[PDB]
Amino acid sequence: SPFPLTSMDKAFITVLEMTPVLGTEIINYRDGMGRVLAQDVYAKDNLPPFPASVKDGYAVRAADGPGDRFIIGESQAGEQPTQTVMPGQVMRVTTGAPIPCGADAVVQVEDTELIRESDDGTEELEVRILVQARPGQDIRPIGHDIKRGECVLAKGTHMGPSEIGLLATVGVTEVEVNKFPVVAVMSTGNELLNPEDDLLPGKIRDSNRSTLLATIQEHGYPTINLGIVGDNPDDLLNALNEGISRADVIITSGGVSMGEKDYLKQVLDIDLHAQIHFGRVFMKPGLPTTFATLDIDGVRKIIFALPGNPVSAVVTCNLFVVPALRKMQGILDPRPTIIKARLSCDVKLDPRPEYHRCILTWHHQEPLPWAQSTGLMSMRSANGLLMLPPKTEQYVELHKGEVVDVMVIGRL
């Protein structure tokens, strides 16, 4: 105190190394969006479970070849056929209907001509097959798509709609997944009012709590609103104890610089007995960013004490907090996606690695997107974080059009 300046790269790997993976629970498959499977999932049935027509047409004997055929009836979707197709006969079929016994190929309706139908016009009676069917033509054999006993999803799979649909397909409606982190957010400062309050002398509204909670909720994680806590050790300790009790992760903002009434670091170390892994980061913005762990009865709580400056708080939440939460919910590689974009504007480099919210836009047919710093464009929310390199003797400035790293923080 003052804590050493931690490199940005050391701070980041420290968060990922020291963050735990949460335990597992069984969920309903319909709740599986963004969850990570903690089990392999196996088909207990064949898909298709019967030989299925690929086409609307006729089930035939390929050995009959082309010619004129009696239609003995129809194989209807959802019904096992009871007839056997004999030589010179066929049965109508629709897409996904079972192939009746006696038939070994399907001929699509376009390769046929109807000869005779019922007086009512509701029943086909005789058809001309115009082609020589290949054996097994336009049939999905049993287990063509999925075999009984096949592993259809591996443990470690990060599920979206198509994985949910596969769980439905194989009838595995209950699955083991990692828990989502529960994340408690508090604001600190005697100067802060609720968003709902009219201003009073010397005061401003608390924006960080709203911004950070919304940032966590955007990624699908449950949250706990711990309110505004005054600049005093006892109150801060009480709020932190409530967060540890109710949540896996505690986010504070404010009170981490070396100011007179910046108390969070003292409380985390002396009162709470947490391990502070870093208390300053060589980065812009976010110098005072603080990361702590607290082990209670073989459970690791994680604490991010972010800076009070609203821009710092949201930038550091995106860099440190979101990857940690991804790790806790079981994502094997929790690192953010980093893309290449073109700077929309000349920018001066700082001795510190520098980060700024931006909007990524793809122009007509140019391969790389443009990054426009947020500091009609105002109709869209930030979807990137510009990652600017530390200045060097070589480079003191980057020019409009230069290719830069941008971390994805938004979902178009």
Partner: peptide
């Protein structure tokens, strides 16, 4: 065709 050097097209 121009004998005068152009500027980078998209920038």
């Amino acid at each position: 065709f121009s004998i005068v050097g152009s500027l980078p097209r998209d920038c």
